[PDB]
């Protein structure tokens, strides 16, 4: 099964590892080396995540053990072990499962890599996706490492990983005062401000008023030049966006990292350096 214009693109080659072997397409997907890899992590983890719902906080017969997607949770081991493997039951699952996350995320990127390698397109997507993965490598590896405990990670619970975000947040009082955190936020907002703007314009030029032709880039420019003056540019936005997106994550990564390993006091207070400046 291929698209009206797929067949003429399914070329052989452009593989990183053992490509020729797994070099083929299963439905609308691609496999190759990394293709099989990720899968070997998917079920090996996805099922473990289910095994957690099965087992539960204490036991499968317990009253805590539930199957409500909301209440489901897979918390990491205590901070006692630090950088040690805790019993599969007492934190082990999380630890192992997480190792499957990196194997899924990273491979998924690597897989995208050669996938682009075949279409001779740019490696933008993967490189971009890297950040997302990188950000993850911070909320589970980097941070915990400089904190000396794999238990610093976040629980794998649809709603469970929100509390971990509330505590660690208040752990520094009003977590709204974090420099990197603020900055990052701005980006997330700008980004959304960009999408709501980009996507909108396109549809507003290719589907104008009734009895009207498809506008051209000639309009797009003027449009935003008549509401606020300047127009970033066609691909410019596709650049800007990509930027915001990544920047949003980057600055965020920093945001949490600095929180703890590089600062134990309360963020609201950090801003004091600006106050204690010999100028006021």
């Amino acid at each position: 099964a291929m698209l009206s214009f797929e067949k003429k693109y399914r070329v052989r080659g452009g593989t990183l590892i053992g490509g020729d072997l797994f070099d083929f397409w299963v439905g609308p997907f691609y496999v190759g080396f990394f293709g099989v890899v990720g899968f070997c992590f998917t079920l090996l983890g996805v099922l473990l995540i289910v095994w957690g719902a099965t087992i539960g906080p204490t036991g499968p017969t317990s009253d805590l053990q539930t199957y409500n997607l909301w209440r489901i949770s897979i918390a990491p081991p205590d901070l006692s072990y630090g950088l040690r493997m805790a019993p599969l039951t007492e934190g082990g699952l999380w630890q192992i499962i997480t190792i499957c996350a990196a194997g899924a995320f990273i491979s998924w990127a690597l897989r995208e890599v050669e996938i682009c390698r075949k279409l001779g397109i740019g490696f933008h997507v993967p490189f971009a996706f890297s950040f997302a993965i990188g950000a993850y490598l911070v909320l589970v590896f980097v941070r915990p490492l400089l904190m000396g405990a794999w238990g610093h990670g976040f629980p794998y619970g649809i709603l469970s990983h929100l509390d971990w975000v509330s505590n660690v947040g208040y752990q520094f009082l009003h977590f709204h005062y974090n420099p990197a955190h603020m900055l990052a936020i701005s980006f997330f907002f700008t980004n959304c401000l960009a999408l709501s703007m980009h996507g909108s314009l396109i549809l507003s030029v290719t589907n104008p008023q009734k009895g009207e032709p498809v506008k051209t880039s000639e309009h797009e420019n003027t449009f935003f030049r008549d509401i606020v003056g300047y127009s970033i540019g066609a691909l410019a936005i596709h650049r800007l966006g990509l930027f915001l997106a990544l920047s949003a994550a980057f600055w965020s990564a920093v945001c949490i990292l600095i929180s703890g390993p590089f600062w134990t006091r309360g963020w609201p207070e950090w801003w004091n350096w600006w106050l204690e400046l010999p100028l006021w």
Binding site: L162, Y170, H174, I258, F262, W263
Partner: protein, 317 residues
């Protein structure tokens, strides 16, 4: 504006407060904690006394509290006090050259109260102070006027009428936040309801104001930086008001929130009548007490330094 990149370095302290992976964790700077302890050390207790001889009220004529004690013990409790309060100005601080019993110098008068004050704490408010207790040092730490004392903060400057907006200024009171920054007076001094977290699922039951919660947040901030910890310490942020979950400390502090009131409402406020100008705030109110006063940025004053135990005169007789 700018983004932080590391004013403190790794690996920071760690203290697992809640169940594995609940977010409830304490992270403290290693070095800082060191310096804090070091510079925040007590004073070795004085040598034990004979505890015999005659009684205080026996020989000493003008004694209203330390009577129970003997001479050596009382002479001792007189020494300690001088080293803890005015080790700088000697005994002449709360007395008159010769008149070991005169009550002309205000420093004495208060000292009396302050005495009962302390005792009370150790004798009737043990759920808070525990079997440890507090001494004149805990607050005075060797200074006639406790460094960490407070007063009704005036706020920002007078725009000639619209000045009431007392929530726009980073006061060290609230950990450099932008809250009212003066929760000590309305709470630590008064008794304004701190609770605002609705106890019912749907609306129509709790009339609490949004500003109100900002106020509580205020106080909490201040408290948080007083003991020098993170809310995780007392609670699990997803249950700011569920006690069934929140932390033993949460309650312990509860009592203090009043032990402080007590200390201001029944001891520190009355003495204002005799306290001089430099001891009175702009609003005429006297320097009161706060969690910051004792704790001074340490969950347990002097890191659990048990001083009062070695001083029997510092307990209700």
């Amino acid at each position: 504006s700018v983004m932080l990149l590391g004013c403190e370095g790794p690996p920071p302290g760690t203290e697992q407060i809640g169940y594995r992976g609940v977010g409830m964790e304490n992270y403290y700077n290693k070095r800082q904690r060191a310096l804090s302890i070091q510079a925040n050390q007590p004073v070795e207790s004085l040598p034990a006394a004979d505890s015999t001889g005659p009684k205080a009220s026996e020989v000493y004529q003008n004694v209203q509290v330390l009577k129970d004690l003997s001479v050596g013990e009382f002479t001792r409790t007189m020494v300690a006090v001088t080293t803890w309060v005015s080790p700088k100005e000697g005994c002449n601080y709360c007395h008159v050259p010769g008149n070991w019993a005169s009550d002309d110098i205000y420093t004495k008068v208060v000292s009396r109260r302050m005495f009962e004050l302390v005792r009370a704490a150790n004798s009737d408010w043990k759920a808070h102070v525990a079997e440890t207790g507090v001494t004149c040092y805990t607050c005075h730490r060797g200074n006639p006027v406790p460094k960490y004392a407070w007063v009704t903060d005036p706020g920002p400057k007078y725009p000639s009428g619209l000045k009431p907006t007392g929530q726009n200024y980073g006061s060290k009171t609230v950990a450099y936040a932008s809250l009212p920054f003066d929760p000590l007076t309305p709470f630590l001094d008064q008794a304004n309801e701190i609770r605002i977290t609705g106890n019912a699922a749907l609306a129509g039951s709790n009339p609490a104001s949004l500003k109100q919660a900002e106020w509580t947040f205020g106080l909490m901030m201040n408290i948080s930086d007083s003991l020098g910890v993170g809310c995780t310490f007392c609670h699990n942020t997803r249950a700011f008001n569920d006690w069934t979950q929140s932390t033993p400390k949460r309650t312990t502090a509860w009592y203090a929130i009043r032990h402080v009131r007590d200390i201001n409402q029944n001891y520190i406020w009355p003495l204002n009548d005799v306290l001089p100008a430099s001891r009175k705030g702009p609003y005429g109110d006297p320097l009161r007490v706060s969690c910051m006063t004792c704790h001074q940025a340490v969950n347990k004053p002097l890191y659990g330094a048990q001083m009062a135990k070695d001083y029997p005169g510092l307990y209700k007789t």
